[PDB]
């Protein structure tokens, strides 16, 4: 038994699902520790992916006498843990080199003859958050390619295992197979905070949701926002919190992908609703010239999962897929509107798209939108809708049956789903 | 006698005698389902997960005994789904308020199986069955007692399945180029290929009865053994060819009861089991399988799902006292007390016990009516492993809770005529906290929080007229609910505020009226014909939502849940038809059930939303007895209208199936 990576395709003109052979993920980085790969960026026609290092499993562990263990006592000796993180006996749990960061570049969907390319300034680039791994690798309007890492391996039990790097940005020029001279100590612009997630802007403007107390597991205290623009302080960058939000204790969550559109983004909130008060989610437009939010569409649901717009032949219409959760069961509902800067929607009163809950949704450009899901749940298949001829939102024909996924993204014609799995060579 | 001494009690309760089913090929679960306000849902297929619901109260909320021993942890090897009929002397259930003598905490209900302890000095019983789809069902069932006061009594029985009916569905096709997919528009009528099920069980007693000291001592020892075939997921779309479960359970107990332990009147009995369950879940194919049979290569991922190789073995033990006194007809006094002790953990162990005590009293004056009041003390104790780290999993603690309430009620009935009876019923119930509700986190602050038991307002009404008028026989029964809980258990939503929440909290409230209606017509002794009604209307009862906003499903219908549903029998009886002694049966059954949309009626356009269709099936059955029920034979057609079924969503059930029974019993 070794560690692979598993990639799977669905092509989005033909409908139809591929699996590619299972990469070998043993000593990916040459260390011996296995790697799950968090974001797929296209950018220069080509493909950048985040190594992130897994420790050594039971394969690791045992190769060639302890050959890759540096740190014997880290080691499981006991089958246990929460099913959750469970782990197995003799295998080492988290990496043990986590003052670095991997990059991958590809130049094609094929995932061949990877570029490994090592940095010494930053940790490992991804977010996390108990299970979830979030892309923190994305391109400029120019082609640049910036890393962020918040050195999440500064909560780890084992002080071998804790980084001492602060979160900070590096990038990767436009055409080019290595890291520049550029560092930004983000750590050093926000007053020793880290962030949970970031996202593209617009230009070199990026939106970085900051922790408002200590780095954790569960994401508690991430309830500020904040724009960083790369060249900002002569090529050193620089961070504004932004304006207009409201107050960090009367924010429950964000959306987990905002839309950007005009050089601004759009961004779901959920407020918690003072008693006597009428506080309900809404879509906030965030502008990063001035670093200023703006409340606008009001959603009238428990969730938001996605934002975005689909047309077909002289039809198109703004897209929110909202989330309702009652009698601890939950569905979600595709609403269509017309602007995301005023009015109301709500799927009261018998009003728009019901299905049922996705693990992923993803807009294809203004063409689709795909709700990706696995063998497991309510209904374990990945589904696509688009617009009919005459407006309205419908299924497509076609359906698939994917494995499970822990980070996603679009190249070409395909969407590509890549997890870290169990597999024989 | 004993069912009609239920079912004339001042309790909601039903009692129905199953030794008039024992020549067919139903289960305890079949018996069950023409309890009013009781509802069965099926996955489809012999042994397939099933789920009791009861006046809409399901799962954790309805608790089954087996002569006064809970079940609540046994595995699925020994179940309500495949244990025959042949097993229960008589089923009684319970509905909302439950009388002391079972120490359970129970907010829907409970049903009780009770298995004949009047046998004769040497009996023997055996029975065999053969069906459509490779189906074999089999059991066995002899014991003797000797002059000496020793007696023993030997169960045993097997079901088997390949559960290869038809259903329709989309099927997954494989391309040439080497893609794959589903294409919904195209809808195939294939055969089940991965759904093959058998359980085997056997049960022993051996004891005394009969003594000075003992009126019974007995010593038994059961063990059940089970294999399935996983053929879908939650939605029939989902298909696996190769994933399978296995599990087994052993049980021993004893059992000892007297009358008149130390004075007059005063009736003691002492009860203690043992159980203890394996599990192994078994998925680790390299092949997708469709809906035709066919396979393609997953290009070295293992495991069709999620690979797994997966064994559990877990045990937990209980122990019931009851003492029973009276003083004439007119005060009866019940005292009872039950402790169950779980260990969920295949150094802290995750460890559960429960200590439930009752106290009941009723006054009968005279023969018009009579009053119960009763008082139940509940006590729970739960205990895990909680961490204080920065990541929660290196250093760890134990953590304790304690949960306790008393519960009440009264149950009252009044003769008013010869024949017309009305009773009123009360209690508050409760449903105590689980262990990997309170400690699931594993977190040290988050475990401290604690959660309280959920709870309820039971009260019920019924008015029974039962009349003879010659050869006429005739019983009406109509019976009004009304429940009211609150403090439900309920997934937390995931945020990121500046607060910490666990993953479960007490919110949640339910309001439940309905109704029922019973009828039975019998003339003389060869026309019988029977019906029930339920309807109720469940509603969400939230005004506010977690986070403090106007809840859109307030005052809304509980999804995925059926409200309105009836059956239907009626009976020939032919005796002495070739000789005296033989008799002849034919009877006809029909279900009804009305759709019910699967999430909030009141969310989403309905063109667009999943609906499970109103069904309405019937059923054919044909007897033979010869000399006295020493020989039978019987036929049955289930689904002779070939209707699509489904209890859940997209899980259709077999069509037409024929089936056929042959069974002997001998005593004396």
């Not at chain 1, 986590?98 to 094609?108: K, T």
């Not at chain 2, 008149?260 to 002492?270: E, P």
């Not at chain 2, 999620?306 to 009851?322: C, E, L, V």
Request: hydrophobic content about 30%.
């Amino acid at each position: 038994v070794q560690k692979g990576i598993a990639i799977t395709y669905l092509h989005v003109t033909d409908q139809i699902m591929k699996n590619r052979d299972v990469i070998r993920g043993e000593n990916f980085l040459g260390n011996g520790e296995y790697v799950t790969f968090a974001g797929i960026l296209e950018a220069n026609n080509k493909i950048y992916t985040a190594p992130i290092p897994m420790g050594l499993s039971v394969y690791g562990s045992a190769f060639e006498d302890g050959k890759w263990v540096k740190y014997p006592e880290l080691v499981k000796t006991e089958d246990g843990g929460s099913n959750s993180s469970s782990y197995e006996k003799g295998e080492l749990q988290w990496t043990q080199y986590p003052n670095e960061a991997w990059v991958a570049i590809y130049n094609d969907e094929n995932f061949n003859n990877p570029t490994l390319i090592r940095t010494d300034k930053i940790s490992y680039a991804c977010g996390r958050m108990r299970s979830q791994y979030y892309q923190t690798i994305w391109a400029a309007d120019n082609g640049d390619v910036y890393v962020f890492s918040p050195s999440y391996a500064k909560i780890m039990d084992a002080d071998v295992q804790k980084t001492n790097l602060p979160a900070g940005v590096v990038r990767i020029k436009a055409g080019a197979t290595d890291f520049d001279s550029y560092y930004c100590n983000l750590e050093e612009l926000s007053g020793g905070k880290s962030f949970l997630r970031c996202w593209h802007i617009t230009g070199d403007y990026f939106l970085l949701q900051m922790y408002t107390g200590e780095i954790n597991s569960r994401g508690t205290g991430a309830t500020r926002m904040a724009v960083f623009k790369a060249t900002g302080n002569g090529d050193k960058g620089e961070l504004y919190y932004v304006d207009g939000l409201p107050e960090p204790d009367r924010i429950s969550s964000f959306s987990g992908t905002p839309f950007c559109e005009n050089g601004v983004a759009y961004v779901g909130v959920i407020p918690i609703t003072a008693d006597g008060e009428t506080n309900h989610p809404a879509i906030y437009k965030i502008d990063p010239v001035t670093h200023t939010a703006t409340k606008g569409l009001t959603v009238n649901a428990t969730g938001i999962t996605a934002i975005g717009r689909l047309a077909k032949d002289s039809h198109s219409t703004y897209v929110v897929s909202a989330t309702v959760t009652s009698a601890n069961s939950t569905a979600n509902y595709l609403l269509a509107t017309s602007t995301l800067e005023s009015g109301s929607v709500t799927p009261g009163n018998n009003n728009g798209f019901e299905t049922a809950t996705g693990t992923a949704w993803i807009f294809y450009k203004d063409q689709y939108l795909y709700r990706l899901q696995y063998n497991q749940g309510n209904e374990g298949v990945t589904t696509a809708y688009e617009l009919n001829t005459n407006g309205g939102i419908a299924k497509r024909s076609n359906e698939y049956t994917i494995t499970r996924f822990t980070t996603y993204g679009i190249f070409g014609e395909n969407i590509i789903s890549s997890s870290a799995v169990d597999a024989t060579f | 006698s004993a069912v009609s001494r239920v079912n004339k009690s001042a309790f909601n309760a039903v009692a129905i005698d199953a030794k008039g089913l024992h020549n067919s090929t139903q289960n305890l679960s079949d018996a069950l389902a023409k309890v009013p306000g009781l509802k069965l849902r099926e996955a489809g297929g012999v042994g397939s997960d099933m789920i009791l619901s009861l006046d809409g109260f399901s799962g954790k909320h309805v608790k089954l005994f087996i002569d006064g021993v809970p079940q609540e942890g046994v595995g699925s090897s020994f179940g309500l789904n495949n244990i025959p009929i042949n097993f229960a002397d008589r089923i009684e259930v319970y509905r909302g308020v439950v009388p002391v003598g079972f120490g359970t905490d129970a907010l829907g209900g409970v049903i009780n199986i009770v298995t004949n302890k009047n046998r004769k000095n040497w009996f023997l019983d055996a029975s065999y069955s053969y069906g459509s789809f490779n189906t074999h069902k089999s059991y066995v069932n002899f014991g003797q007692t000797f002059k000496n006061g020793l007696t023993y009594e030997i169960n045993a029985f097997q079901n088997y399945s390949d559960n290869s009916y038809y259903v329709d569905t989309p099927v997954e096709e494989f391309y040439e180029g080497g893609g794959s997919a589903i294409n919904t528009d195209k809808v195939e009528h294939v055969k089940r290929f991965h759904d093959n099920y058998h359980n085997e069980a056997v049960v022993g007693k051996v004891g005394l009865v009969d003594k000075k000291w003992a009126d019974r001592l007995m010593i038994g020892l059961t063990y059940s053994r089970m294999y399935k075939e996983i053929q879908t997921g939650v939605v029939q779309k989902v298909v696996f060819g190769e994933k399978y479960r296995k599990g087994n359970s052993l049980m021993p107990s004893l059992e000892y009861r007297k009358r008149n332990l130390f004075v007059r009147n005063l009736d003691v009995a002492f009860t203690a089991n043992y159980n203890r369950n394996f599990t192994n879940n078994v998925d680790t194919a390299t092949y997708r399988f469709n809906w035709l049979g066919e396979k393609t290569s997953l290009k070295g991922r293992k495991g069709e799902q999620s690979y797994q190789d997966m064994k559990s073995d877990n045990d937990n033990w209980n122990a019931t006292f009851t003492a029973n006194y009276h003083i004439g007809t007119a005060h009866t006094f019940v005292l009872n007390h039950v402790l169950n002790t779980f260990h969920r953990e295949n150094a802290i162990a995750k460890v559960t016990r429960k200590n439930i005590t009752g106290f009941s009293y009723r006054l009968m004056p005279s023969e018009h009516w009579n009053l119960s009041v009763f008082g139940k003390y509940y006590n729970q104790y739960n205990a895990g492993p909680v961490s204080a780290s920065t990541s929660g999993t290196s250093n760890y603690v134990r953590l304790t809770n304690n949960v306790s309430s008393v519960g009440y009620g009264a149950a009252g009935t009044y003769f008013i005529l010869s024949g017309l009876q009305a009773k009123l019923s009360y209690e508050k119930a409760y449903r105590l906290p689980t262990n990997e509700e309170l400690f699931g986190d594993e977190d040290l602050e988050l475990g401290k929080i604690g959660l309280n038991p959920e709870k309820s307002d039971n009260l019920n009404f019924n008015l029974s007229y039962n009349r003879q008028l010659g050869k006429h026989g005739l019983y009406v029964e109509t019976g009004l609910i009304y429940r009211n809980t609150s403090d439900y258990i309920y997934r937390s939503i995931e945020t990121t505020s500046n607060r910490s929440y666990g993953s479960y909290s007490n919110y949640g409230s339910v309001e439940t009226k309905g109704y029922h209606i019973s009828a039975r017509y019998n003339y003389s002794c060869w026309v019988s014909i029977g019906g029930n009604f339920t309807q109720m209307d469940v509603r969400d009862n939230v005004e506010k939502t977690q986070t403090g906003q106007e809840s859109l499903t307030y005052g809304a219908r509980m999804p995925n849940l059926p409200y309105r549903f009836a059956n239907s029998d009626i009976s020939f009886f032919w005796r002495n038809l070739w000789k005296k002694g033989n008799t002849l049966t034919v009877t006809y059954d029909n279900m009804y059930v009305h759709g019910f949309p699967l999430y909030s009626e009141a969310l989403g356009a309905v063109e667009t939303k999943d609906i499970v269709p109103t069904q309405f099936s019937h059923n054919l059955g044909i007897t033979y007895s010869l000399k006295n029920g020493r020989y039978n034979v019987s036929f049955e057609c289930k689904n002779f209208t070939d209707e699509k079924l489904y209890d859940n969503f997209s899980l259709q059930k077999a069509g037409r199936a024929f089936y056929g029974k042959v069974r002997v019993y001998f005593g004396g």
